[PDB]
């Protein structure tokens, strides 16, 4: 065959906890166009893989990753194919490069039959999250063909400025997350809405301060913004995009329900075994991993797992495993991919550290125990963002993981790509 969406009845996997190394990563970073050069950071990475195709994005800067000079943004798509080694790999088919790379932010790719549609924000004020009041909401869609054609005009690459956004009570909406899904001919991108603190409806009584002696009932609401006195709060959700409508292009915002509400954060909606799952980064006090089956897409309500083993590093005020309401904006994005719904086994990369972004560990886990895991790097390895998508290769469950790591071999912060087969047997 080739590489397919994880759906139907795939090959069995060890379902029992073992400490022996039965996962062996394969490095496939040479397949993406990360051309190293001394003194250039490569950040804002994006990875999506749907139906045997994939989307990837990065921005390479000269010097620092924060204050470096934006050199080049690239958005690309291709096929995920067998190397020959029965090991899945990325092969680029189509890459777009905007003329001004410092203008494009928070891209998000959703696959639909012939293309990857990549929704991005356009800003002349920097990151909208850190310059919310000055950002004039402006959105773009880069549509890229996964199989380019010879003499096709704009079939290969079409840019679209968005001009009609329905956003309810929110002032501004923006894509916020690596990848989205399709339902029929409708696309859903992970997104965030900016709502003024003054119009935010929230009863402080809902803040669970009960077994937290040093937590004030005001903390949840204060933590709905990137600082306690921020003009806006942020609310996760989806940007819906119905392709059947045709004509010109309407994006509608769907807010997330307030069950286990945390601050708007990079999120992912994906499809697994024939129904949608949602991951949301933990960017505040609620640090245990937030993911689960989507119950309704519109309105958006997630059946969050009660997961007690996976978390993320933080800073002094909301470090890993913190559970008490604090006023903080900190954490990392480390998603997971459900690979077995009946047992709720997921696979993902977590940073095995409390207040430091390091030690990427690929792990297969249920709600209350990690079944088996393996490091992806040495034990002082700087690493922050991880995107994990899983699929079938001749019916074997594989997972590809992007990790933004500090590479000591080049002395450079950049993304790396791993392939990991989920093993069937539990011994050696």
């Amino acid at each position: 065959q080739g590489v397919s969406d994880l759906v139907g009845l795939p090959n069995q996997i060890c379902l029992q906890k073992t400490t022996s190394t039965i996962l062996k990563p394969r490095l496939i970073s040479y397949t993406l166009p990360i051309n190293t050069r001394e003194g250039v950071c490569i950040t804002d990475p994006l990875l999506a893989v749907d139906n045997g195709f994939f989307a990837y994005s990065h921005l390479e800067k000269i010097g620092s990753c924060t204050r470096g000079i934006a050199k080049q943004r690239i958005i690309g798509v291709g096929e995920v194919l067998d190397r020959g080694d029965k090991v899945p790999s990325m092969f680029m088919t189509n890459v777009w490069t905007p003329p001004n790379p410092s203008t494009i932010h928070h891209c998000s790719s959703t696959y639909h039959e012939d293309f990857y549609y990549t929704l991005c924000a356009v800003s002349h004020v920097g990151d909208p999250i850190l310059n919310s009041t000055s950002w004039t909401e402006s959105l773009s869609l880069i549509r890229l063909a996964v199989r380019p054609k010879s003499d096709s005009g704009d079939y290969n690459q079409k840019y679209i400025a968005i001009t009609k956004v329905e956003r309810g009570k929110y002032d501004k909406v923006m894509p916020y997350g690596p990848s989205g899904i399709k339902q029929g001919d409708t696309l859903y991108f992970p997104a965030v809405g900016f709502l003024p603190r003054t119009e935010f409806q929230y009863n402080d009584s809902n803040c669970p301060i009960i077994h937290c002696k040093y937590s004030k009932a005001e903390n949840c609401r204060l933590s709905m913004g990137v600082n306690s006195k921020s003009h806006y709060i942020l609310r996760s959700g989806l940007l819906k995009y119905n392709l059947s409508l045709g004509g010109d292009i309407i994006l509608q915002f769907i807010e997330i329900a307030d069950n286990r509400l945390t601050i708007g954060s990079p999120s992912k909606i994906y499809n697994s075994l024939g129904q949608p799952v949602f991951y949301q980064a933990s960017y505040s006090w609620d640090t245990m991993i937030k993911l689960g089956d989507v119950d309704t897409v519109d309105p958006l309500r997630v059946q969050w797992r009660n997961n007690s083993v996976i978390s993320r590093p933080g800073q002094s005020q909301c470090p890993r495993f913190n559970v008490c309401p604090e006023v903080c904006w900190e954490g990392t994005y480390n998603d997971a991919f459900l690979i077995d719904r009946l047992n709720w086994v997921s696979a993902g990369v977590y940073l095995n550290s409390n207040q430091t972004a390091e030690n990427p560990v690929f792990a297969v886990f249920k709600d209350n125990e990690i079944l088996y895991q393996v490091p992806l790097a040495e034990d002082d390895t700087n690493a922050q963002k991880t995107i994990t998508d899983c699929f079938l290769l001749e019916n074997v469950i594989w997972c590809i993981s992007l990790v933004e790591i500090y590479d000591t071999g080049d002395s450079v912060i950049r993304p790396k790509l791993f392939a990991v087969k989920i093993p069937a047997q539990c011994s050696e």
Epitope: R312, W329, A357, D380, Q384, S411, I413
Partner: antibody
Framework: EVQLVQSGAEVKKRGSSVKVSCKSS????????INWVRQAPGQGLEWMGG????????NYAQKFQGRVTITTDESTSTAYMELSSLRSEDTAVYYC?????????????????????????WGQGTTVTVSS | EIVMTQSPGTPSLSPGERATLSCRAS???????LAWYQQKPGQAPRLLIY???SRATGIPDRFSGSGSGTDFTLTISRLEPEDFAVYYC????????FGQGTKVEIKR
Amino acid sequence: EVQLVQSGAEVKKRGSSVKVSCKSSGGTFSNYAINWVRQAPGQGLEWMGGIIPILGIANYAQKFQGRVTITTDESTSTAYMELSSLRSEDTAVYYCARGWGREQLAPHPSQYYYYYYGMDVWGQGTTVTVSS
Amino acid sequence: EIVMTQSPGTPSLSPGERATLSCRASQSIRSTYLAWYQQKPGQAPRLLIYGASSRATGIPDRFSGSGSGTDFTLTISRLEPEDFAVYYCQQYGRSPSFGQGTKVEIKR
């Protein structure tokens, strides 16, 4: 081999400022870090701050935050340390020293950290005496 | 905001003896962020050990470093005359800081 050659001795009045320099002389700063380390007479070494010139960024020990600025002229391959509001406590030998320096992903949505590693190339030091 | 404290204050040893110096951290640190320096009077310091055990380039075999967490140790297997100097430990990373120093002195 590189050599860090520092500026000459200084005698500064109570309350003034001083700007020691350190020139790289035999290789540039390329992606290393320049640290500044002072030593009062009879006393021990004390890290003041550092700069990583290939990035923009400079970092300081809390004790010196506000009083110390560290800069570079990357073209002439030179680093500077400016200490203001000087007092008798600042009478010391001020060393300039090179090592690895590195930007680090932080467990934060926007912040980054900066690590200064061990210092293997040292300048000869600059004595500065604060007296009236 | 990490403090390094050094011991002994001032040991007296003889050429050919073995010196072992100790450095204690006010809080746990990864081994990879510990360094040892040497300083003779009227001279700059020179790096001896880094990453808590790796000898700097050009440094004789008799120098070796060890320890972890809170406690680290520098060992001169057999002293030469030029080894009688001051030794500083240092933790580095986001805000490096030095120990207060240990002077190794000739015994008679």
